[PDB]
């Protein structure tokens, strides 16, 4: 059934699985029309499909042309997500196909179940975790490729950079979720924390800076402090 605190280590076992997050598929700016009405303008989006054991990120870029002439875009976006996840699975060799797909929003279950009827052995699950994958567009290199796309495109990343050379996938996922949660709670501060030291650079083939183990512990502390801080600013505690 659902993925929650009690079965959290299942994410890091040897059964291939993917998280799917659709919160950045359909993105709009809202603006006033000359007549003083309100209209939306779509901007490019992306499906966030992540293997939490390996870090492999399948970033399907959703170009604004896919919405042209369509109605009920927020409902279409869930089906378009499901259509693209199903196409990815079919594109993978059998032994790379996931045994489970975990959606971050329950509204994806039926769209995905329906698109995956051909794969009755792939379990489609919700989760009670509140994961911060919506903040993936606060990672500059991911936001850049999304906004520059002029056509539908799939781009492959490792969201863990080279961390798995030194730490486990449980710790790598913990780090990622902490970073993303911070970026979601206060993007400016989070990015300030991540980049304040110009001697620590982001490799051309990486998403995050090249911190030593010692520097990551400090960074991770600063991110917790930020989250705690914002919780205080927010609730006045």
């Amino acid at each position: 059934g659902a993925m929650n605190s009690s079965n959290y280590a299942e994410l890091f076992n040897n059964d291939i699985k993917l998280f799917v997050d659709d919160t950045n598929v359909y993105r709009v700016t809202v603006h006033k029309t000359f007549e003083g009405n309100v209209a939306t303008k779509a901007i490019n989006g992306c499906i966030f499909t992540l293997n939490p054991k390996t870090g492999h990120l399948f970033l399907k870029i959703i170009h604004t042309s896919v919405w042209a002439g369509q109605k009920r875009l927020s409902q279409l976006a869930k089906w378009k997500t499901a259509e693209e996840v199903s196409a990815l699975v079919r594109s993978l060799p059998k032994e790379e196909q996931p045994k489970q797909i975990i959606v971050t929003r329950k509204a994806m279950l039926d769209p995905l179940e329906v698109h995956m009827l051909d794969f009755p052995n792939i379990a489609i699950r919700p989760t009670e975790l509140r994961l911060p994958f919506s903040a993936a567009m606060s990672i500059d290199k991911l936001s850049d490729v999304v906004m520059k796309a002029t056509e539908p495109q799939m781009v492959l990343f490792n969201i863990y950079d080279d961390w798995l050379d030194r730490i486990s996938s449980y710790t790598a996922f913990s780090r990622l979720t902490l970073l993303l949660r911070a970026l979601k709670t206060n993007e400016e501060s989070a990015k300030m924390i991540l980049l304040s030291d110009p001697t620590i650079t982001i490799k051309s083939y990486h998403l995050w800076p090249s911190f030593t183990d010692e520097q990551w512990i400090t960074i991770e502390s600063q991110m917790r402090d930020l989250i705690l801080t914002e919780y205080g600013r927010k609730y006045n505690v």
Binding site: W79, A82, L117, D118
Partner: protein, 300 residues
């Protein structure tokens, strides 16, 4: 006007005949039911006074044979049987009539209720849902599971209703996933009506039979089938106008007949609210919506 005689009534039982039910006392001088209208299917059903567990009964059409009930003390139930000796049967019934040992099917002349509940139900289709081909009548009880329930255990004693499943390859065309899931017209009109049932009358007959088995035996899988067949229609944007109008009549008489006190277990809150208030056909079931809102506004 036909007759179902009884050899006797040895155990105290509540006997149902269509929508009518009456009590028979242990060894009460009782020989059966007369004046049964020709032209409709009928159901004679039983609930023992000493164990209301297992309601059970028999669907039959008197045009297809001479049928009687005889208690079986080994199997512990009232069994339907066919008498092939037609002269023997007439003689037995005549004597039961002369001694006023039969209760009369109590139809009020104004009352089209049974016709309206069984309008599209046909013994030949009942016998394909309930497989027991050596008899011309069909046994149903409270506990019998459906072919779909067994997928999700004895196949000889199952209800072989048509499997309806909205998240199935049958229901969803490759490349029309969203379209077919949100508007089920393909599944209703091409798969089910053109493909499986052939016409709407056969679809309505199964729907009505499933309702009646839900109501008279509390058969849970029958209730599931009844609601699925309603939902498939209400969730289709394209339904022939004559089917919608007839559906409204069908459901109206079903809601009208339902025991007020059983609405909590025979009516699915989700399906009905969806069908009357959110579905494509939310405005197409005027009679049903009016009787539902005036009789079961709590469910809605």
């Amino acid at each position: 006007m036909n007759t179902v005689p009884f050899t006797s009534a040895p155990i105290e039982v509540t006997i149902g005949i269509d929508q009518y039910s009456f009590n028979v006392k242990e060894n009460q001088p009782f020989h059966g039911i007369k004046d049964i209208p020709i032209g409709h299917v009928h159901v004679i059903h039983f609930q023992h006074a000493d164990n209301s567990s297992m309601r059970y009964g028999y669907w039959f059409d008197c045009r297809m044979g001479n049928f009687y009930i005889q208690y079986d003390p080994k199997d512990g139930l009232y069994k339907m049987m066919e008498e092939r000796d037609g002269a023997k049967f007439e003689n037995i019934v005549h004597n039961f009539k002369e001694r006023q040992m039969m209760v009369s099917y109590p139809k009020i002349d104004e009352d089209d209720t049974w016709y309206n509940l069984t309008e599209f139900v046909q013994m030949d289709k009942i016998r394909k849902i309930v497989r027991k081909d050596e008899n011309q009548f069909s046994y149903v009880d409270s506990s019998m599971t459906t072919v779909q329930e067994n997928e999700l255990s004895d196949p000889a004693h199952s209800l072989n209703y048509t499997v309806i499943n909205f998240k199935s390859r049958e229901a969803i065309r490759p490349g029309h996933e969203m379209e077919d899931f949100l508007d089920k017209s393909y599944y209703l009109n091409t798969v089910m009506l053109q493909g499986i049932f052939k016409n709407s009358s056969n679809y309505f007959g199964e729907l009505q039979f499933a309702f009646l088995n839900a109501m008279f035996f509390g058969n849970y899988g029958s209730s599931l089938q009844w609601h699925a067949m309603i939902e498939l229609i209400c969730s289709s944007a394209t339904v022939p106008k004559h089917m919608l109008d007839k559906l409204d009549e069908i459901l109206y008489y079903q809601i009208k007949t339902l025991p007020e006190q059983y609405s909590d277990i025979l009516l699915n809150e989700r399906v009905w609210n969806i069908c009357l208030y959110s579905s494509f056909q939310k405005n197409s079931l005027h009679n049903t919506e009016k009787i539902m809102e005036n009789k079961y506004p709590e469910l809605l």
